[PDB]
């Protein structure tokens, strides 16, 4: 019960085969969630190269709504995986606690679950055993998908046992005898999760199990009047028993209900002694253009910043700005230099205040007269 620097507390639960325990870091006081995987139950091959493939594959899938995996510790008896811990419990327990939820919170959970399944589909992995008991809540009321790799190994081994244990969560293809589910189970499972977030109950519930399989094969479900008819078209386009008409991520991303309150970070791109390293500093601004145009570019830059400047030469410009909060004014002087016929250098020079005990700072306001100019010039 000690891995890394983590002691293990009381076991939370044993859902299918994995023993999930809370881990605690004695030094830093941080709560992690370890998962024990007995090799007796579901492991056929014991080659360490498979564990190396696990270490290479599973760690690099970083997403703000997927439970991140930290390391997979090997053991002669078991397999330990340190997933992150969240104190908000399962989604199904939250549904059983609060009943029917508001639409604005159900869409907020549904967008996060769909953007956690879209990250998996972009990174070529599916979550076949998706359910409200395998999505957790954090302290900040978000949605966290528990696993992606764990279902894939299990579903191939015992698809019939998984279907017998829960028919409603299992896909119509799996009960119809299709070999591999693929991503078509993911949108249908996110649809029954959306029906749980909109109505509280389960859409496909029976006591007698082959009649429940017949209810899965039937494309009908219950619909109350508590929910608006703008989302029932999405539910009918999402919960089809035939995967030819089942909704895609694009077919939800072009739907009207899904685009109402959508955060931008969910979808990345829509249209697509001492040792010190020496530094190479420059002098001014090196612009390879005409000298009559660089002064106009400097003019266009300093006109936007509301400065008060005068000239002496055609390339000697003594600028002066009044600070908003500080009553005094700061002065400096720009000058153009010719290092070669191609490039021209813009040199800054400060001048000292002679008589006035000005507050604030002298040279830091001098750098404030330049850090607003470099950004606008961008050269």
């Amino acid at each position, epitope marked *: 019960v000690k891995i890394g620097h983590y002691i293990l507390g009381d076991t939370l639960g044993v859902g299918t085969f994995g023993k999930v325990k809370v881990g605690k870091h004695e030094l830093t006081g941080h709560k992690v969630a370890v998962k024990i995987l007995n090799r007796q139950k579901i492991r056929s091959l014991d080659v360490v*190269g*498979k564990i190396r*493939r*696990e270490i290479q*594959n*599973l760690k690099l899938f970083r997403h703000p709504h997927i439970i991140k995996l930290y390391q997979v510790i090997s053991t002669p008896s078991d397999i330990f995986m340190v997933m992150e811990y969240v104190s908000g419990g399962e989604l199904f327990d939250y549904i059983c606690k609060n009943g029917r939820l508001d639409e604005k919170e159900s869409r907020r959970l549904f967008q996060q679950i769909l953007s956690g399944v879209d990250y998996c*589909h*972009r990174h*070529m*992995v*599916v979550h076949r055993d998706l359910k409200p008991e395998n999505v957790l809540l954090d302290a900040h009321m978000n949605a966290k998908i528990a696993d992606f*790799g764990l279902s*894939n*190994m299990m579903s*191939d081994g015992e698809f019939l046992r998984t279907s017998c244990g829960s028919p409603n969560y299992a896909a119509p293809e799996v009960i*119809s005898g*299709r*070999l*591999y589910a*693929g*991503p*078509e189970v993911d949108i249908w499972s996110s649809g029954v999760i959306l029906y749980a977030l909109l109505c509280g109950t389960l859409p496909f519930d029976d006591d007698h199990v082959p009649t429940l399989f017949k209810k899965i094969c039937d494309g009908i479900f219950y619909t109350p009047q508590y929910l608006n008819p703008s989302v029932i078209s999405l539910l009918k386009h999402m919960l089809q028993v035939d*995967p*030819m008409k*089942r909704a*895609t*991520i*694009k*077919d939800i991303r072009e739907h009207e209900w899904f685009k109402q309150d959508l955060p931008k970070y969910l979808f990345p791109e829509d249209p697509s002694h001492q040792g010190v390293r020496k530094a190479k500093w420059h002098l001014g601004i090196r612009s390879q253009s005409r000298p009559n145009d660089i002064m106009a570019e400097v003019c266009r830059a300093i006109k936007q910043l509301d400065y008060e400047w005068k000239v002496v030469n055609p390339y000697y410009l003594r600028v002066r700005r009044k600070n908003p909060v500080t009553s005094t004014y700061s002065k400096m002087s720009l000058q153009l230099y010719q290092v070669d016929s191609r490039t021209y250098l813009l040199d800054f020079r400060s001048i000292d205040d002679e008589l006035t005990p000005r507050p604030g700072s002298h040279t830091i306001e001098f750098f404030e007269m330049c850090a607003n100019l470099i950004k606008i010039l961008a050269q």
Partner: antibody, heavy 126, light 106 residues
């Protein structure tokens, strides 16, 4: 219950544009990349085209680069291989096949072609 | 961008054959094996060159030795007489093998 019925085959004139389809029935075409292959009589398989609708990225073999515009229609679950400027050598039977690029297991990134169609025979002759 | 090169052979019923596939460049474990009966559709046998596709039984087995992918057929039934195809899929372009045919011993 997955069947990949090809259509649009037959016999064409060289220098004529053909567009053969693949009615993907039994799954969703937006996730899986429909791949076409070339099977010359007596020779082996040869990959020609690919379109992946989920990321919107295609692929092409070096011998058919930029000449066979592949297209996929997710609304009718078809895959349109619009061939253009075909040579006399391009005379084969064209099978249709779905492609599963996903992690089937923790250790195995499956990258095979599961379900194959019957394949229509196109014959090019002057 | 690369090429493939299988072997070619012929053996009897129940014999244990092997088919190598020398990859040109360095690829991962992403090589499949397709059984095509003459005048039929190519059936998939082993997807990642080491693990068995669901369906066809455990007679077909594959081993990986660097960039030399193998296909071993133990206990050759009298129904598994067809043409076998190596298939590289890890890179951008997909290149099939030349295709080995298995003939009954006579």
């Amino acid at each position: 219950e997955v069947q990949l019925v090809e259509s649009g085959g037959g016999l064409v004139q060289p220098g004529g544009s053909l567009r053969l389809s693949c009615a993907a029935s039994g799954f969703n075409i937006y996730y899986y990349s429909i791949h076409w292959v070339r099977q010359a009589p007596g020779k082996g398989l040869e990959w020609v085209a690919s379109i992946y609708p989920y990321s919107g990225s295609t692929s092409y073999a070096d011998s058919v680069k930029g000449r066979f515009t592949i297209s996929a229609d997710t609304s009718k679950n078809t895959a349109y291989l619009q061939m253009n400027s075909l040579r006399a050598e391009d005379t084969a039977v064209y099978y249709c096949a779905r492609y599963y690029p996903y992690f089937i297991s923790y250790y195995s990134k499956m990258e095979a072609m599961d379900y194959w169609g019957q394949g229509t025979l196109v014959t090019v002759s002057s | 961008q690369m090429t493939q090169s299988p072997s070619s052979l012929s053996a009897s019923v129940g014999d244990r054959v092997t088919i190598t596939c020398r990859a040109s460049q360095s690829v991962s474990s992403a090589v499949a094996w397709y059984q095509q009966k003459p005048g039929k559709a190519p059936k998939l046998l082993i997807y990642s060159a080491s693990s068995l596709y669901s369906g066809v039984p455990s007679r077909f087995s594959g081993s990986r030795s660097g960039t030399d992918f193998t296909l071993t057929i133990s206990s050759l039934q009298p129904e598994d007489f067809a043409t076998y195809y190596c298939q590289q899929s890890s890179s951008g372009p997909i290149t099939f093998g030349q295709g080995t045919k298995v003939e009954i011993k006579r």
